[PDB]
Structure formats: C-alpha cells, structure tokens
C-alpha cells in the first residue's frame, strides 16, 4: 500500500494480518456492473444500500443483517457489505450470511491490500469488491484489478480526486465509485463532485457515494450521467426511505 497516516494506517495493517477465511460460496457470480447497466435500460433507479452498524465518522446502530438485505433485496441493484472490523463493526460473517440468503449482487466493502481478502470476498460469496486509489499504488491497482477479473469479478476502482481518477483511467477501470468522503476528517466534500463526474468516459459505469439522503439528490446526479448511487447512512439509519429513492 501507500504511506498512509490516522485511522487508514491502522486498517491497513489489520487487511494485511488479516487471516483468509473458512467459507465456499453458494451461487455463480452475477455482476453488480451488468446489473447496474439492465437497470439503466429499463429505467429503474439503481440504488446500491450498504450494511454497516459503524462508521468512522459516528454512526451507531444496531440491525440485523439478514432482515436488512431481505428488506432491501426487491428494491436494489446491489448491497454493500462492511466486513471491515474495527472502525466498521463489520466482519465476514455478516457477508457470508447475507450473500447466501439473497439474490441480488453483492460488493463486499473493506479495505483490500492483498489477494487473500479478493479471494475471501470470492469464498464468502461476493461479486465485486472496492480497490481505493488512496490507499494503494498504481501497480498494486493493476495486479489487483487483474487478480480480481481473473476470478470473474469486475471491481469497482474508488476515487476521491481527480489524481485518482487519472490512475483508475490509466489502469482501465470500467467501473468507478466517486466518493465524496474525505478520509481525513471524514466529512462529505462534494466541491469536486460534479467536475469528477464529468470527466469520465463513456465506457465506464459510475457510482456515486456521497451521504445521499434525498430522492432530489439522486436525481440531480442522474441529469450529470450517473449510472447507480450508494446509500449508506441514511438507508442504515430509516431503511424505509428506500421507497423515496427508486419510488
Ligand atoms: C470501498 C468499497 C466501496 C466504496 N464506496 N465508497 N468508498 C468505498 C470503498
């Protein structure tokens, strides 16, 4: 990885102790980019809802896992599921639960540095995983990217900036994640949003993570080209706000 500092240094050690897990999966990769673009041509707001009890910047809650992605299951393109431990109270258990108890596709949310945690996500049940351009350099992006289509899976590069895009693009991402989330205050900064979105190409489905909470804001972005939108908080906060999103 990266020279990092703060919280993302110390996951970053934790991913790379992080021992591969017991576990096999149950059906055939479906994928969560293909999903996204038969939503988009039958006009269906894709909507991907992310599991998560914690997060860094404060959330607290408690849900069950595998009632939060019934719930959500007729409703969305995909689920994000954290399996990141410290700062997100997640763990694999929470995947392997939720990728065999629903059919929709999965992307597995965590901080990936090394093949084992893509082969977990394969074992556990996922279709797709996050690769974050801010935490691993351009070659280890390449081999990663690589190790994960070879797998069958097409991963989601995320971007914060337009240097990360730079490298998604040069490294042939075909599918980006745009978040708005600062990792070092860990505050929404949207200020390069829209200069972001614009700026990539035609091949490439985008998905936009943000701290969205209101149908207008999905619908301003889908004006700018964006293809699918991850939900997290406020979904993990009133689930029931998934009708206002894909009503
Ligand atoms: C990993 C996987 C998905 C993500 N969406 N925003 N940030 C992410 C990091």
């Known amino acids: 990885p990266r020279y990092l500092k703060g919280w993302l240094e110390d996951v970053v050690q ?40 914690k997060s860094p910047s404060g959330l607290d809650v408690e849900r069950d896992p595998i009632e939060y992605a019934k719930f959500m299951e007729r409703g969305v393109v995909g689920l994000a599921i954290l399996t990141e431990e410290k700062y997100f109270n997640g763990s694999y258990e929470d995947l392997r639960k939720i990728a065999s108890s629903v059919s929709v596709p999965i992307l597995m949310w965590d901080i990936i540095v090394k093949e084992s945690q893509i082969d977990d996500a394969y074992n556990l049940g996922a279709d797709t995983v996050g690769l974050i351009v801010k935490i691993l350099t351009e070659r280890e992006l390449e081999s990663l990217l690589e190790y994960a289509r070879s797998l069958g899976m097409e991963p989601a590069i995320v971007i914060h900036d337009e240097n990360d895009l730079d490298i998604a ?19 929404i900064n949207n200020e390069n949003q829209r200069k972001l979105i614009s700026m990539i190409p035609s091949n490439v489905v985008k998905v936009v993570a943000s701290g969205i909470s209101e149908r207008n804001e999905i619908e301003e972005l889908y004006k700018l080209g964006v293809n699918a939108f991850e939900i997290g908080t406020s979904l993990m906060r009133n689930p029931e706000k998934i009708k206002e999103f894909i009503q």
């Open 14 to 53: 934790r991913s790379q102790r992080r021992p591969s897990v017991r576990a096999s999966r149950q059906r055939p990769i479906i994928s969560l980019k293909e999903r996204i673009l038969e939503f988009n041509k039958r006009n269906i707001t894709a909507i991907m809802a992310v599991y998560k009890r």
């Open 169 to 187: 693009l040069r490294i042939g991402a075909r599918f980006i994640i745009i978040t708005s989330h600062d990792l070092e205050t860990l505050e």
